[PDB]
Amino acid sequence: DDLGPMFLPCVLVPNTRDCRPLTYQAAIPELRTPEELNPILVTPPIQAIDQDPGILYSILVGTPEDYPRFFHMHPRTAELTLLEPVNRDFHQKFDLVIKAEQDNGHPLPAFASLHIEILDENNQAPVFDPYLPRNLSVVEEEANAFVGQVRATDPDAGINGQVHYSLGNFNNLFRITSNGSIYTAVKLNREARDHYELVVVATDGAVHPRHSTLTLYIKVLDID
Ligand SMILES: [Ca+2]
Ligand SMILES: [K+]
Ligand code: NA
């Protein structure tokens, strides 16, 4: 008797001869174009094979219901195409059911799920507080001495608005904490060097991060 297709990979549910059902995965940034994004990468790659003729792939049903305005699945290659840029204010995700059927003979179809996440655009870079003191004094011959503190904010929502601090230079002489506090990492020496132009970097938590930088002028003071 004819057997139908199965989606890959087929990992058997233990103490059965049944494949565990698959949920394929994709993620698409909102507002980007078809031309930029196509073909959409699916993980793992969509594939079905005859358990024993040809194979036809389709999207059977899905939600939200206007998915056919946004996606096309090639019937022979399973390649997934975006048709229009998605706006995350209208769609945060799509959940699709896909099917594979035998071309010659009874369809004996297999089914899988396909989840497509829509990623929020990271519209803005962090913005340092404009009235921060940037001329900073610190005494020599002191390690772990507090130098000063910066702050930046980011308008975007979620991870896209969460600010992280790092130094752009002199990473052997200073350090910065998650709240923007800068300390010496070693004992400085005025006689050796009395001035540093230190770069602080503010980065957001986005998949595609944005960054800003601030210059601080550090003066090393005599112990007296
Ligand atoms: Ca941002
Ligand atoms: K958005
Ligand atoms: Na078959």
From Swiss-Prot:
Compartments, as annotated in UniProt: Cell membrane
Glycosylation sites: N135, N179
UniProt note on tissues of expression: Expressed in brain and sensory epithelium of the developing inner ear. Expressed in the retina, in the photoreceptor inner segments, the outer plexiform layer, the inner nuclei layer and the ganglion cell layer and, more diffusely in the inner plexiform layer (at protein level). Not detected in the retinal pigment epithelium (at protein level). Expressed in the spleen, dorsal root ganglion, dorsal aspect of neural tube, floor plate and ependymal cells adjacent to the neural canal.
Cadherin domain mapped to chain residues: 20-124, 130-224
Domain remarks in the Swiss-Prot or TrEMBL record: Cadherin repeats 1 and 2 mediate calcium-dependent heterophilic interaction with CDH23. Three calcium ions are usually bound at the interface of each cadherin domain and rigidify the connections, imparting a strong curvature to the full-length ectodomain.
Assembly behavior: Antiparallel heterodimer with CDH23. Found in a complex with TMIE and LHFPL5. Interacts with LHFPL5/TMHS; this interaction is required for efficient localization to hair bundles. Interacts with MYO7A. Interacts with USH1G; this interaction may recruit USH1G to the plasma membrane. Interacts with TOMT. Isoforms CD1 and CD3 interact with TMC1 (via N-terminus) and TMC2 (via N-terminus). Interacts with PIEZO1.
Disease: Defects in Pcdh15 are the cause of the Ames waltzer (av) phenotype. It is characterized by deafness and a balance disorder, associated with the degeneration of inner ear neuroepithelia.
Biological role stated in the UniProt entry: Calcium-dependent cell-adhesion protein. Required for inner ear neuroepithelial cell elaboration and cochlear function. Probably involved in the maintenance of normal retinal function.
UniProt name for this protein: Protocadherin-15
Naturally occurring in which organism (per UniProt): Mus musculus
Gene label: Pcdh15
Residues of the full protein shown: 264 to 818 of 1943
